[model samples]
Target chain A: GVQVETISPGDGRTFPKRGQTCVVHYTGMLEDGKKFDSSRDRNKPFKFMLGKQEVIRGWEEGVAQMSVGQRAKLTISPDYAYGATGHPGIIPPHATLVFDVELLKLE
Target chain B: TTLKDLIYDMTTSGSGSGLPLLVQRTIARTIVLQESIGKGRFGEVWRGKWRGEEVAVKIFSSREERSWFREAEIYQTVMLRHENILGFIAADNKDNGTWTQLWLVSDYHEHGSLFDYLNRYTVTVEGMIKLALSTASGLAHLHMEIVGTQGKPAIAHRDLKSKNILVKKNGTCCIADLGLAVRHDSATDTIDIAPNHRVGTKRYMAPEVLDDSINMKHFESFKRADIYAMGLVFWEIARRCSIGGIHEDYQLPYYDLVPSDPSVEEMRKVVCEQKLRPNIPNRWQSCEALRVMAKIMRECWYANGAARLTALRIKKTLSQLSQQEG
Candidate 1:
């Protein structure tokens, strides 16, 4: 049975399940080619343990879908990321999302 | 085909060997690598010389090593040559058994970071304008330039602060530190989940950066974060001389009214729950520059990232001020 992913309000990056940990290299951008984040730039991969509330809903679901060494592009809708409320001076509400992700491992 | 092309080719070939491309040991009478001039998370800066010309060499730590090719790409593609933008004269990558050393060479400014400069010497309105123009121009270049080689990405200075701004003796400024910089295309989907500890300095961070609820999946958000800091820097410089010194007890723009030792929940109350106003300087109540500064700060402090000014807009406004003041 396919379980629907729960979406968080605002511009959240959806990953896999809750409390599931994964290592990923990602690049985030707006629809207009404006870059927002890159793991490569920081010279380190991101590590997150899912279901631990270590990340937002979008990140949890997005990483859950990935297997080791799998590279995927996740274009999250605002609802799954940072919904209507949106954060101040950073994520605007109703902003669509884009992320190029390479899942390295599940720790 | 032309003299410029020939020079460009020569420069490119010279840059390929990973030697100190700008300084020749033979013609240079005394080549000295001085004590550390500046330090940051990525690496440290040292003063060097060739012939009698002073240069600043930024040496990245092993953890922050970047290829010479990458450094050159950033210099060429990003409009990183404004009067205030630190000029890159050369770069070298030295490989050791366990570590690789990346050296970026730029014109050495005898004057130090803006923070140090301000503390040592008092600045006039003219001086402030010069600093403001230089810093804004450098940031404007980073925020807007699109040139990059195929497969290489455009860049953004995710971490911009007063300390990263190097002041030249000629009353000019330039930006340093590209270690945290990311290319436009490659910046998506990357997350630093270690409790938001790595992205920027706490004092200069945008409210959203401090809040977990904000979605930072995009780089524009980071740029907006930079803009917010830029506004604060402007305010800081404009008020630094008058305020006696950088306020150690100073809370962020509006920290006094909020609870002490603000937890994330407390931050939510001050940043999210309540609408706060940025502290406006009494001296600049009528000054147009200060007014503009205040307005930008307000926009930057807007509880929503979408409402903040773009770096381009901030640049435009600052340029307008320069023209008016000059």
Candidate 2:
């Protein structure tokens, strides 16, 4: 366990549900700490919903585990990440994910 | 195996409906709703029967609600009955606390999806052109119509894939799955309630849809998205059928160009930034038909959607090409 912290547990979280929105602060970096996405950089927290197919499976599952105001560093395998369908440019489809996430609120 | 044989196998194996109880419930609620006939990124499809007539019923994943009503509305109001457009039957909505059931009923094609059909049988050159022409006709119909007082809305089948096209026994075809379609008139430049930018299958999506920077002020841009998909579908069909001198097993142009799990930024780079060409097969040099098709595919792939041919123009060109070959 890499310093997993629960800030605020979401009201009712599941693997796949509709109209479920979450606001969070996150810093995405390679295992080597090359930053990709960071809410702090933009001075705005990221907001997304589960089961919307808006984000990858890893983020969906990873965020589900955190409570509102909770913070955690997620180490996601490629299986939960993009599999054989490697994204061409930024993150290869087979790439793994590392994110420091702070769950803010459920809207 | 022939396409007919596959249908037989699918029907007998209960491939129509994956789950038994759910199928029973669907049938009980509606006169149709038979078995789970098809499945998508969202949920399962059940074959519905009303008065002994056959139909396909799609049950979306809970997250798919945003698209359900819009899709139903498009099918009901916009799409006119045609040889190539899948006919709409009815839609049902049930509020079941945790998860709602939204069922869309459409005419059933015994031949199954065009993707499955082409995978099973090899067709002659004539057959290939016919398939392409049929699809073009369908797209043309959607792009232009004399019906409706305010001049028919220019509809874009935002999601166009092999799985969305259906073939009949006579080799005639129809386009299905209007779930992700966008009406050009109502939508705005900014992301709508359901973001068009995030919609569509990854493999078939056009560059502009991936890149938000591309101005969609012109209607032609949206139509170009359809044209690009049409070219891909034609390429797919041609690859399988060995049409226009293309060898069987010839890899589809650009089949592997895009990564599978493309990030929004990555997709924008390859589709918008790099401007990569489709992987044309070597055999295209010898066949005039293939040459024309390759040229059109490239045109559709133009970074600027405004530069692509109109759907009506595409249909006319293909029809004439078929005649020249004959």
Candidate 3:
């Protein structure tokens, strides 16, 4: 199950559609709070189409529920995130990931 | 916990120091244009929506690519973040099938530029000194080069004027518009002035600049020219000082002598040929604070570029003047 913690609920009246692009700024960390990646640090934002298989299962589900200008913290178990064969070099095997995400835009 | 904290943790964890890019498309698509606030030769600026916050989005014309790129690079300079400098958020370019739209996002100040603020309200002694001190501090830091692994090159604000400054709600001001700024590479001792067709405002141009007598090859020459413009800005602020319920109307420098949109020749005649400077009201001598400000302005307006005071010196003088009033 993906755990959702709203840091700041966004103000957009509509949520992202399946084919629409979702623009977001996010930080990914291990369960122990070690930061592995952040779009803010790079002064860049991340974009992907909703319901697309471009990202992890957790992101597809977690971001679909967000609105424009909403910030949240999402905690994903290995099942929703990386499985036993976790992302090499960054994510460990069966690692649980925590993401601090801000949905900047939905188009 | 915080954005800075996240950056700190990543740095200590041995991440590479090179800057980042490629997320422009993410921001471009999401931004909702709220309302147009101001316009210039570059393009119109709008108060836009960003994650529930108000952000200033400056949309540049397609042909103004050089200015947009130069300013974006300058804002991202290592260790450029400062309270007295305008906060840069993100720079993005959206390419449709037909055309590309360039956008620069920054922190929005409700008060707008100092020119707009002074026209609406006169400042108290405390307010005048704070505005003066903060702007000088911004310039001093901009001109100072920090030497280290993450070193910053010395920078000069080629276009310094009231319109190019934004006043914060806290009564202090931050220097904005780095499109015409230049960076000094101490390693090679070269000036990195952007190759743009744009020039500084004619009314605010220093004598040397108007007459082409400035030594552009030397880096200090540019800083000295900035001091000249800073003095003019100080004059604008000083005029709006409400002392004992008395103050002059807000006027641009050389309001009486030159036209509203003066040309290079007109400014050259007044600044370099006639050696005319903004007049310091004789009544300023009655107040200690005004007296010191007048003195600094005089030093900053010296006809000889090298004779003008350094930004650090001006910053130190105003800081002490501020403390004396308290």
Candidate 4:
């Protein structure tokens, strides 16, 4: 179960295409209201090439819906989260995740 | 199974490109490994026969899983394929009950690495330019950033060496060993550096790299470092030419200075503190191709990383020399 909220639906002109690089600012959290990771902490945007299998599927699918200057919230289920063998120390097995992401800019 | 599908897969990212993991496993399962080619910190490379075709199989030890995975990822990067770059066929992991057999399959060249090629045979000026130009073209394509939906990330072959460059059945060379590569995402201007603890060949390391002053965040810094190594490769290729019988034995860049496997500290002293590069034979000035290469070797290894020649510049210069040689 994954729910997407468009905090700011961009102009819908374009979205990140496959293998296209995207710059985003994100704050990751557990469903229990605890912070795990935040790109906002370093004051530098998190960047990754889209559809390259470099990120978690949830983030990959969640970020695809974003556009230039868009912002959104993603509530990801355990399946879309880290799954049974969740990320050690950070994500528990069968854990759900909440992420606040913003499409900072595109080159 | 389908040609169109395979081509389509190559046009996208993260979906396919490697001869589908299914067929890969099928072939890998029955592939006959004939002989051990070599071994390294990772593991071994072997000559394997798959479906009656010879394949160079790079098998990684379990400890080098990240290197294997990262190399496969870099090879599968959309649009990373080029004529000069090694042609990747497939990659898969097989469990041996004790440890995993990490297999990276590619076109096998009987001539072996350029390192091996140069050790045994001397080349003419044309052969020298062909090797240098092909190597430069490969690096140029690797360094060139394409911006499209199915574009390739600007990649730096962090581990560039004669041993890593394979001589094809044709006289040209193909860049191999993407294990230490880093991809630069241009739209976001970020480097997806490999998480491996592996370092570049200490002997081939750039001056900036030897001193730990390399700008890790900037992608250009990595490219410049590659140029420094490219310069060293040029010198290596040039020294093997039989121009007027002027070329001597095939010694490494700093063979006389550094030990067989020099350490970072030793290389730092020789490269940075002393600001010394490979000694260029002044006799190279006689041959036209060697002259261009000698000049390039000088510019490629600038103590200042920023002063290093670009891969494209090297490629163009080599191309002109090649044309002149023709």
lDDT tens digits, residue span A1-107, model 4: 66789988876777888868788888778878987666565455666667654466687788888788888998998877657645422456788999899987665
Clashes of 4: 0
**What is the per-residue lDDT of model 4 for residues B198-310, given as tens digits with 9 covering 90 to 100?**
87999999988888888899999999999999899888888889866666788788998898889999988899988888888777777667788889999898899888789
lDDT of 3 by residue, A1-107 (tens): 58888899888576888999888999889999987678777666777877644466688888887788889998989977756635323566699999999999977
Candidate 2 residue B98 Cα shift, in angstroms, is: 7.5
Off by over 4 Å in 1: A1-107, B1-31, B39-43, B66-73, B76-79, B95-102, B147-154, B186-197, B241-278
On TM-score, the leading prediction is 3
Report the C-alpha lDDT of model 3 over B92-191, residue by residue, as the tens digit.
6554459867778777898999999999999999999999999999999899998775567899989999998999999999998888889998989899
Per-candidate TM vs. native?
0.57, 0.62, 0.75, 0.73
Flag regions of model 4 displaced more than 4 Å: A1-107, B1-17
Model 3 residue B270 lDDT score = 90
Worst 10 residues of 3 chain B by lDDT: B12-21
Which pairs in model 3 have colliding backbones?
Answer: A10-A70
Cα lDDT of model 1 by residue, B213-324, tens digit: 5566676776777777777677666655333343232233445655544455555555555755557766665667667766766776776778988767777887787789
lDDT of 1: 0.59
